[model samples]
Target: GYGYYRTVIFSAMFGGYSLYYFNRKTFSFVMPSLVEEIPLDKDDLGFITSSQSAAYAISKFVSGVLSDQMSARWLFSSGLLLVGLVNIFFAWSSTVPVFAALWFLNGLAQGLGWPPCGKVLRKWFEPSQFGTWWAILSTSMNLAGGLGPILATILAQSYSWRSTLALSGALCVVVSFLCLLLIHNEPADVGLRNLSTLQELLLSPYLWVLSTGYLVVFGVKTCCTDWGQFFLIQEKGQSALVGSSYMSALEVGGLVGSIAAGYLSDRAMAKAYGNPRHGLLLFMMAGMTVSMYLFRVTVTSDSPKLWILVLGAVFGFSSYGPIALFGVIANESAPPNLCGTSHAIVGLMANVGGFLAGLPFSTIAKHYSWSTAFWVAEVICAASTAAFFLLRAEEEKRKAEEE
Candidate 1:
């Protein structure tokens, strides 16, 4: 009975999140085409992207708060439906103002995607298993992020950009309704009662630390995802299709890293009798630092261009490991009742990072070399490594208390 319920919940959440990316990434991948046909420049594109980031961050925070009160089934399904409709309007838009408004609304809908899922997962899964399940679910984003570009490219090449987005929006609508049919708000729906309170959730310094850590980790990751294709095309002189395809490599690496990080975290947690999240986070950040440096090397040098894809995968693996791990860590640290809020805070920081990384990083890349800008992100990765160690001491304290 538990197994069947778990499968049902996992499939719905995973499919919902994965489909959400179709709308989210539609703009990113079709951006090249947008610039070609529209009277927009990179700066204009940057502004639009930044607007989405800001709106998404705020929306996610609000949604996180609401997720605790509401049913995940309705929240998740409604959110997906809203974004789907917005993307349809976005496809019909021609002017910047219209696009900006629609995209911003889309961001709001996007915010609804993750927190409800977190609430469901925290209710159903144990901390020991949370890492693996969360990591596996996290791959939905990576997979979609990787595949969206290629799919968008193919559709755009075959039809118009307008059609590509419209079709994607339509698919999102389909998935949204399907998700509504499959997901239950909690195990209570199946005659299970789980209780979690909010006081400890608010007081937990560990949540704050993880929130800040995710801010940095996801900031860099978003910067890379948003701009990596642009950087490869502009600075490295690769074709648009080819540059965008590298994201597939990045996602592939994320797939591998998510599973590995999850397994390692579980093992460490068991061995140390504490949350070993810090160790796994530190390892990931260190790898990210090295991978980012290698990416810089590939792009800056006159070396074989194929290495760019390889290094992108490496960078992706290192970065996505922590991205996947953060949710598990936050879920473990949070009170059951406040799990949504905990994950929301982490998600908020992530989008804030994305906002900061978007236009600001673009300006940096424009003025200085892209290499210099990436090196700056690399430094943040190193700092995040050190920041994670701070969590270890607290984790040990908590473990001691529990024992």
Candidate 2:
């Protein structure tokens, strides 16, 4: 019946989100192996990684617009299949140009995975339950984040990095095809009658505000996760194993943060203080800016400080809160019929931020040092926090008008 259909929809969306995690963490897990095998310097590897991030950012907007016009199922399937294939291509690339091209293509394709899922989430869940459902869904990313690195590490260390990547690539193809069967557009699309009234979504202001906020929060999250291992190895002089261990701590923290943001949003919406939910996002940005500052200034290699873990947890929490919130906000504002479009647009913006995250770090570090790169990132974090003040005021005014 309706309940059975809902469960299937949930499964499909969860699978879609899970593939993102599966593919994304592979690079971090195998960075050590790639560094050794490719015979590339740190700066060269940085450029290649940054290029992927950049392409991913650009693809988000493109895919988001396309997802509105086409069935997300097809976009998701094709993107998943292609990204996985690219991972295999990347695993075997023999030169820098090939590596960069494959990595860039991988990022561009991965961008397809996110916004479409946003569209799916908006379509399947009622606005009232959007926060709760998204919270649970966010956990899938956490699950993948934790699982991918561990899986890749084991496979790479035991066999070769290329083989490990191929495993994920194969999963992508299978998951993509499965999703096509498992997912659909809306309740009515499947002959169900009951659906919520999707409110009119104002395009320019809401999208701009949300996208700007997401760009900052998502940018930091990507930068921290992507660059953590390299920073630890090159800057702190830690072994790759030790650095990855620290990175694992951050992922665990990110998982906790995603759940917390979801619960927070659910509670806020339940209490009819949706204004407060947006306010919390601003607070998170402020906290994140401070944490980024601490990260840039503090050192923890010769002697690992307990506070370092605390800082990492704080950073992860702040970065992830906005990511979870972006979906919730999109759901809240989007017109029911254009739900997919709104989600895609916001998801695309976040990817744009994701792209910015990696490249600046690389370009800065190449010209300067890792410390300088961290400092530059901290500046971006702080500016983003400052911008949240503008967003908070607009959000509060809007809420007041609604009241």
Candidate 3:
């Protein structure tokens, strides 16, 4: 029965969180249509995305603290409710300011997705299996992301881009209501009395170092997720459907990568004498480096579409393994009470990098060149590499001291 309950809880969180991505990700899919209809330039588009990212950054941090204190069921469902409504309302808007405001609200609501999941994951799953469950949970994003663009393309062609967005939002709103009924807050409390304080989380050097790793991870993520379609269309001369569907491969690869990395890291942990030190993250980040290089070098105006698809998938494969695994590291790195907030800390850094990707990255592309912008993204943040190495050393040293 415990296992059955755990499965039920996990399934609810997975589906609910996947719906959240429908609202959050649908914006990027419709960007090309918005540009034509609203007649926005790249800078204006950058401003709009940066606004959404900024709000998400703040909301995620606040939501993290609140998830630790409040009921997970309410926090999770309410946020989903707001985002769906906000997204539906977004379909009615025509101007940049209105678009920015609507997306900002959506981002704020979207913050409600992860922290509650983190809290529940901590409660239901043991440390030994956390990586796999969390990674499976994280792949919900990829699932929705992969499906979203293709769905959007179908709806946009059949109806209009507005309908494509509104329809997606409408479905999510229904799911949001379903979430309230399905999500269980905490699993009949286990008597583990060790809880952590806020002061300890802030003072820990490990969490700060981990923050840098996510900063790099999400920085590159936004570049691909947010701008990848737009870049392909404008720079590589891809059609809107072709460009957007390319991201379908990206998300698909991410889905595969998360499952593989999640299980592999767990196996590595079981075999290791003491600290696991996230062996997969080290290799995955390094793989991320090489994949990005392959993408940069291999693509051109005349490059085969098949090559583009595979390259996109590989980039996602490498990037998302680290994305999912970072949660495991954050939870393992912090204490039980701080479960929600530790994730919030890393999430905050990631969104900050996301914000950087929107405005500065786009602005760089505008001023210099698209190649130059991609080049900067590829090279600017080696922090993840350094951060992981430092984290592994700290993990081994701490365990040595304990023994």
Candidate 4:
């Protein structure tokens, strides 16, 4: 049965992506130690981080196009293997130029991770059930990103940053081999023709709309996740390691939110007997807007630590629900052949959002305050809600014309 293959693919991708985080986040948790032990300037560290993000953002588009024509099994596994090697080399180097080059290469390898996974998702599931399956798959990210910090912190605390990086790199190497053994590019490998022309995929307005939405959703998510750690540490007066630990709560909220939103959106679509993706997106936008505002309030109001953590979780849930669906919407709207491209565009936008969030959003927080930065997220969410309404109207018009 397809069920057996589906389960294997799911487990492989889920585990592969989750372990991918060990490399990506090892740097984040290692930053505090780096500043304390190494002679690097804060500005230089920021530059290295931004460079990696920029490389990753550009690579998403490049790898996505390549993934459409390549094998997911090889592309994904090879990328992880390269990232692991880079991590090992990076751990051994201490010079600024060497670090920058290695991290940038790592960023390029990281780009190899997601698009093929999206291709695998499209291969195994139909659009009708995609939201649920996609949501479940998305949780791997939340869990991994959340857990990575904790694991890295422990390793760095117990030993050294070098030890932490070496261990993370080694695990990534093992996961790469596991991915090679387990994942298939498509059901066609098992005898099915699920192909579509790129020209056909280029015709969907829904794809473009979701791409824009993804840009903003990813921007807000990255801003909150990356800067929010600094915000808690600096503004709220928590220790660096403790503040990083709060990332677990954000992921916890996202894990539950991804599952719930997918199920609810699928139910909404079933009831409407048509694609209700836009409506589902609108609901998430509204929820996210309010949550961002509440998060801002919690930060500014001198609230209890518990209240702030709770609101942080709320913000994570509110934002990630829509973020999870962006891929599902893209997968459903685009033809199977373009699934990699579709998800690649989404990833490109996401990394750009991540890139911009680093400087633009950080500058805003620097001048005004962290609260003001969160307020900016609220504005973005409100604008996204309006955009979703416009998309819904466009969808209705397109359906009418087809009829």
State each model's CA lDDT, in order: 0.80, 0.74, 0.80, 0.78
- Cα deviation at 297, candidate 4, in Å, is 7.0
Q: For residues 12-116, write the lDDT of model 3, one tens digit per residue.
A: 889889988877877788877767676887887788778877777788888988988898888998998888888888987777888889988988988877788
Measured against the true structure, the TM-scores of the candidates, in listed sequence, are: 0.78, 0.74, 0.76, 0.81
lDDT score, residue 79, model 4?
90
> Compared with the true structure, what per-residue lDDT tens digits does model 2 show for residues 1-403?
7768777877887887788767765676688887787678778778887887777767766776677668777888889888789887876677888888888888888777766666667777665567767888779876777677777777877988888788778888788888888887677788887562323344356666777777777877888888877877888776787666667667667777778887777787666733546766778778888887777676567646466677778887887777788777865566655655666667776667766887877888878988888777778878767867866676668989999
Off by over 4 Å in 2: 25-44, 88-96, 156-165, 194-203, 216-250, 273-276, 286-304, 337-403
Clashes of 3: 0
Q: What stretches of model 4 exceed 4 Å from their correct place? A: 31-38, 153-164, 191-196, 222-251, 268-274, 293-311, 352-380, 390-403
lDDT string, candidate 1, 78-151, tens digits: 99998889888888889998988898888888888888888888778766677888887777887788788888
- The lowest-lDDT stretch of 10 consecutive residues in candidate 4 is 295-304
Write model 4 residue lDDT over 199-238, tens digit each, in one string: 6676776677778888888888888888877877767675
Range of the 10 consecutive residues with the lowest summed lDDT in candidate 1: 296-305
What is the alpha-carbon lDDT of model 1 when measured against the actual structure?
0.80
Q: What is the C-alpha RMSD of each candidate to the true structure, in Å?
A: 4.4, 5.2, 4.9, 4.0
TM-score of 1: 0.78
Best TM-score among the predictions, by candidate number? 4
Q: Could you tell me which residue pairs clash in candidate 4?
A: none
